[PDB]
Design a protein around this ligand. Structure first.
Ligand SMILES: Cc1ccn2c(-c3ccn[nH]3)c(C)nc2c1
Ligand SMILES: [K+]
Length: 214
């Protein structure tokens, strides 16, 4: 059995249906118990929650779903009517994320997209009826953070005030992405530090607010 399956099994046996907070806590507890390096975790979750509150997005794109922790984290804060679109390359992770959201009672707010971001991003405008995104959470493959930011721009999916929030920008690192957004007049950037256990290293998130085209 995969780590994802076991996490889901544990949630289903210990958390309360329709209680997103209970789901998040169960995931965090189980991974802490097993000493499994979490993808996100509650401290980084707090940063995400504050971003959501501050910009009040109605349409959010998540790149990378894994077991669904971040999808549950964001969807639970969205208003009625709001949508989260989450892209996941691995069908097994997509399946676990769907079940996790169902358990949390948040499935009504989320659409899971199966495939790679390079293939799915250009389909957002017509297949998924997206005009512009309010927020993007980048948590997929490090070497696509910059390409996908450029692709989002090219497809007309960003507008002034669209928030990009990128995880793991120090470890393993996305230095080209950081150099681009920090250097570009199209983005206003803020960094947030957070420690990773086991590797015992400071990592971080970058918030980059799009300003409009150059
Ligand atoms: C090249 C490449 C690698 C991974 N991904 C993902 C991903 C990472 C974790 N879950 N899903 C997505 C949505 N698009 C890509 C593209
Ligand atoms: K900048």
């Amino acid at each position: 059995d995969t780590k994802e399956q076991r996490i889901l099994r544990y949630v289903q046996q210990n958390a309360k249906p329709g209680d997103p907070q209970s789901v998040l806590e169960a995931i965090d507890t189980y991974c802490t118990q097993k000493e499994w390096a979490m993808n996100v975790g509650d401290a980084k979750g707090q940063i995400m929650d504050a971003v959501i509150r501050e910009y009040s997005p109605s349409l959010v794109l998540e790149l990378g779903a894994y077991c669904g922790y971040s999808a549950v984290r964001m969807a639970r804060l969205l208003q009625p009517g709001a949508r989260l679109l989450t892209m996941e390359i691995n069908p097994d992770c997509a399946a676990i994320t769907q079940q996790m959201l169902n358990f949390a009672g948040l499935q009504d707010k989320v659409t899971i997209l199966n495939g790679a971001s390079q293939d799915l991003i250009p389909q957002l405008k017509k297949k998924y009826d997206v005009d512009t995104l309010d927020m993007v959470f980048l948590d997929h493959w490090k070497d696509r953070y910059l390409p996908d930011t450029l692709l989002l721009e090219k497809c007309g999916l960003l507008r002034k005030g669209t928030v990009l929030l990128a995880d793991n920008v120090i470890v393993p690192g996305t230095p080209d992405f950081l150099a681009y957004v920090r250097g570009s007049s199209s983005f206003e950037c803020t960094h947030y530090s957070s420690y990773l256990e086991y590797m015992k290293v400071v990592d971080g998130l970058e918030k980059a607010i799009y300003q409009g085209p150059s």
